[PDB]
Amino acid sequence: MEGEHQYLNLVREILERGVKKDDRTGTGTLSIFGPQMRFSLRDDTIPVLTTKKIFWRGVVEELLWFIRGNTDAKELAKKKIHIWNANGSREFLDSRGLYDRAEGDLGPVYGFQWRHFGAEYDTCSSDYTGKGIDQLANILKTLRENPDDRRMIMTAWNPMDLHLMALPPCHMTAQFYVANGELSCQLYQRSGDVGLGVPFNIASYSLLTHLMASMVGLKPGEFILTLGDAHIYNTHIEVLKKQLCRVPRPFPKLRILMAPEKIEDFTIDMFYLEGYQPHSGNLQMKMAV
Amino acid sequence: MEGEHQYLNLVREILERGVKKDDRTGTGTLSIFGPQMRFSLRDDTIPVLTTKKIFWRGVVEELLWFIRGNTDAKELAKKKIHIWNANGSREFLDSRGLYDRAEGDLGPVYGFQWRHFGAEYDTCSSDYTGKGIDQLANILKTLRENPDDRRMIMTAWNPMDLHLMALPPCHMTAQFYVANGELSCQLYQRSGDVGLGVPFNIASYSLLTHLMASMVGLKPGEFILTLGDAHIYNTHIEVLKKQLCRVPRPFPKLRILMAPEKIEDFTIDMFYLEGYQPHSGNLQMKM
Numbered sequence: 001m002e003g004e005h006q007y008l009n010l011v012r013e014i015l016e017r018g019v020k021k022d023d024r025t026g027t028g029t030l031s032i033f034g035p036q037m038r039f040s041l042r043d044d045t046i047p048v049l050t051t052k053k054i055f056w057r058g059v060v061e062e063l064l065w066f067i068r069g070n071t072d073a074k075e076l077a078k079k080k081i082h083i084w085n086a087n088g089s090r091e092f093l094d095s096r097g098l099y100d101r102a103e104g105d106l107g108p109v110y111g112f113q114w115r116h117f118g119a120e121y122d123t124c125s126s127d128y129t130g131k132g133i134d135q136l137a138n139i140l141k142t143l144r145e146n147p148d149d150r151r152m153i154m155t156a157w158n159p160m161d162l163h164l165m166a167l168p169p170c171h172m173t174a175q176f177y178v179a180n181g182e183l184s185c186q187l188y189q190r191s192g193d194v195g196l197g198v199p200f201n202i203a204s205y206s207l208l209t210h211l212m213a214s215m216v217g218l219k220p221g222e223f224i225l226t227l228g229d230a231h232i233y234n235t236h237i238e239v240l241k242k243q244l245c246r247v248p249r250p251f252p253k254l255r256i257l258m259a260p261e262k263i264e265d266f267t268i269d270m271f272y273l274e275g276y277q278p279h280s281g282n283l284q285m286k287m288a289v
Numbered sequence: 290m291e292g293e294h295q296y297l298n299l300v301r302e303i304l305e306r307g308v309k310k311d312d313r314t315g316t317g318t319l320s321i322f323g324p325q326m327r328f329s330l331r332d333d334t335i336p337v338l339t340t341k342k343i344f345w346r347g348v349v350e351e352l353l354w355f356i357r358g359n360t361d362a363k364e365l366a367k368k369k370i371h372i373w374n375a376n377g378s379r380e381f382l383d384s385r386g387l388y389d390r391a392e393g394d395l396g397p398v399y400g401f402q403w404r405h406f407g408a409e410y411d412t413c414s415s416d417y418t419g420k421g422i423d424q425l426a427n428i429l430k431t432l433r434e435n436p437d438d439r440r441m442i443m444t445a446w447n448p449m450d451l452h453l454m455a456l457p458p459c460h461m462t463a464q465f466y467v468a469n470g471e472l473s474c475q476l477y478q479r480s481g482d483v484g485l486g487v488p489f490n491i492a493s494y495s496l497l498t499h500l501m502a503s504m505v506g507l508k509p510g511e512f513i514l515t516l517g518d519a520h521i522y523n524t525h526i527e528v529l530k531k532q533l534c535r536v537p538r539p540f541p542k543l544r545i546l547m548a549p550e551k552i553e554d555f556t557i558d559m560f561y562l563e564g565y566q567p568h569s570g571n572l573q574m575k576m
């Protein structure tokens with residue numbers, strides 16, 4: 001009942017006890033409230049699902065993009081990452097009342113808040129160096145100097161910047177914790193697409209915990225995802241029932257070849273997955289409009 | 290197990306698996322990270338502990354004080370609630386570099402954030418009417434018009450206001466959710482004194498959920514407390530081991546006589562605890 005079984009058990013529970021709940025978009029969900037998953041990062045483990053192939057290059061390039069404080073979707077499209085193109089399109093910015101916003105300029109989403117909380121937003125190409133509160137740098141410093149501190153919070157939930165964002169954050173608040181020279185991270189995610197998004201999010205914050213651990217001379221401990229509204233979309237049900245038949249294989253290991261002086265200078269070449277052995281191909285379409 | 294056993298199990302888990310940890314001040318804790326408790330608010334139930342008498346009048350008056358957006362500790366001292374006196378004292382404010390702050394003025398803590406997020410703070414006696422984002426009012430409106438919304442977040446965690454606060458928030462972020470016309474609340478608490486503060490916090494946010502439910506014509510559902518650093522102070526250990534020998538009695542019920550048009554106009558006279566039968570014993574000292 002550890003590891004990937006955590007995720008599979010969450011899928012069953014939503015399928016068996018979920019509540020029907022039309023939703024934001026034209027399509028329905030089965031939904032529960034408040035479920036939690038815990039993943040061991042010990043022995044270099046990283047919880048990348050084996051019952052479904054995860055787009056690992058996508059996870060890495062998006063996280064490095066967050067860590068840099070970047071908000072331009074075009075930067076991800078250049079590395080053939082398409083996950084933010086929809087929400088940064090002329091149509092979608094216009095539907096959000098952001099008419100004077102250049103295509104691919106998502107506003108002060110995630111990374112911007114991580115590295116520049118409270119800074120005035122101009123455009124995604126502006127220079128934000130030394131502007132706002134650098135929550136991530138502050139946490140890294142606290143992990144070196146005072147690891148027992150109970151206020152190591154990094155949030156993207158800034159009520160004043162929500163109207164400027166293409167989308168309000170999902171993975172909204174992370175807390176860090178140290179015991180026995182092990183770094184743990186809890187993520188509060190207000191809303192989780194359990195089929196498509198959550199497996200991505202688990203890989204994202206697990207990697208972040210690994211990377212942050214290597215920056216401050218600590219071993220990785222646990223990643224804990226706590227969800228608000230965890231839902232499966234009605235379209236994903238039959239696909240997920242198939243995924244549940246698959247026997248999980250051991251989780252891959254993360255190898256880190258080096259850690260740079262500044263966390264924002266990490267590149268995909270500095271680390272890789274060793275032993276990632278996922279199963280066959282199966283799709284899950286995401287719905288909006 | 291369900292109910293109060295959620296709390297007693299958490300205490301046991303910290304005593305048996307907790308990590309030793311010298312903390313903020315010259316004392317130790319046993320600590321774990323990320324534990325969760327779920328409490329039913331169905332059939333009018335409110336999870337006020339029966340294995341230890343909870344200072345219910347304190348819970349109610351502090352929450353009504355939060356809901357008003359009040360930050361003056363002296364308003365609570367007038368109702369013989371002393372829980373915020375220490376942190377609003379001359380000495381404590383000075384130790385925090387708040388030399389130009391009048392005794393009892395805690396800064397833009399909790400409620401202020403609930404009702405006035407991002408508003409510029411002056412003093413606790415200033416008029417904040419219509420200033421900053423009223424997160425609580427926005428949530429109440431969303432529960433009437435669009436209960437399926439998944440952004441019903443009320444937060445006290447304002448990175449820019451932390452330096453002006455007497456203390457940074459513990460109970461920092463609540464989310465609300467609706468399913469089968471039942472209102473649920475999840476609380477994220479970054480740090481929890483499991484012995485003294487957590488029982489109080491459980492009563493506080495359970496009451497808020499009951500009150501909010503009656504404002505918008507929904508029934509109460511579940512209250513979920515998710516902790517960051519869940520810790521027992523070494524000084525509380527022996528007392529808590531005794532509390533665990535006590536067989537819990539059924540939780541009391543909350544009776545609400547009426548609901549006013551605006552939630553900040555609730556008064557202690559509008560509701561009461563029916564059937565609260567705690568055990569007699571006591572103890573537990575702060576720090």
Ligand SMILES: CN(Cc1cnc2nc(N)nc(N)c2n1)c1ccc(C(=O)N[C@@H](CCC(=O)O)C(=O)O)cc1
Nearest residue numbers: 055058080081082083193196197198200201286287288
């Ligand atoms: C983390 N994330 C954000 C995300 C996830 N789920 C969502 N679900 C919904 N309903 N709505 C969203 N806006 C949403 N956003 C993701 C994750 C994966 C993909 C995705 O489309 N994955 C493709 C790869 C996309 C691509 O081709 O670049 C895949 O084949 O796995 C999109 C967004």
Ligand SMILES: CN(Cc1cnc2nc(N)nc(N)c2n1)c1ccc(C(=O)N[C@@H](CCC(=O)O)C(=O)O)cc1
Nearest residue numbers: 344347369370371372456482485486487489490575576
């Ligand atoms: C919820 N809360 C805030 C609280 C709780 N635990 C803390 N623990 C620590 N270490 N530090 C804090 N600032 C703290 N604050 C509480 C709860 C109860 C009492 C308390 O001691 N109760 C007494 C005093 C209340 C009074 O006399 O007015 C009682 O009579 O019930 C204090 C703070």
Ligand SMILES: O=c1ccn([C@H]2C[C@H](O)[C@@H](COP(=O)(O)O)O2)c(=O)[nH]1
Nearest residue numbers: 024170171191192193197198201439
């Ligand atoms: O990293 C992300 C971003 C978005 N979503 C999904 C969760 C919801 O199903 C969907 C829509 O978000 P809201 O409706 O909650 O705004 O986005 C995720 O699961 N993960």
Ligand SMILES: O=c1ccn([C@H]2C[C@H](O)[C@@H](COP(=O)(O)O)O2)c(=O)[nH]1
Nearest residue numbers: 150313459460480481482486487490
């Ligand atoms: O509602 C509250 C407020 C505070 N605390 C406790 C948690 C910690 O023991 C202490 C706050 O200290 P830090 O977590 O900020 O170090 O107060 C609670 O349990 N509940």
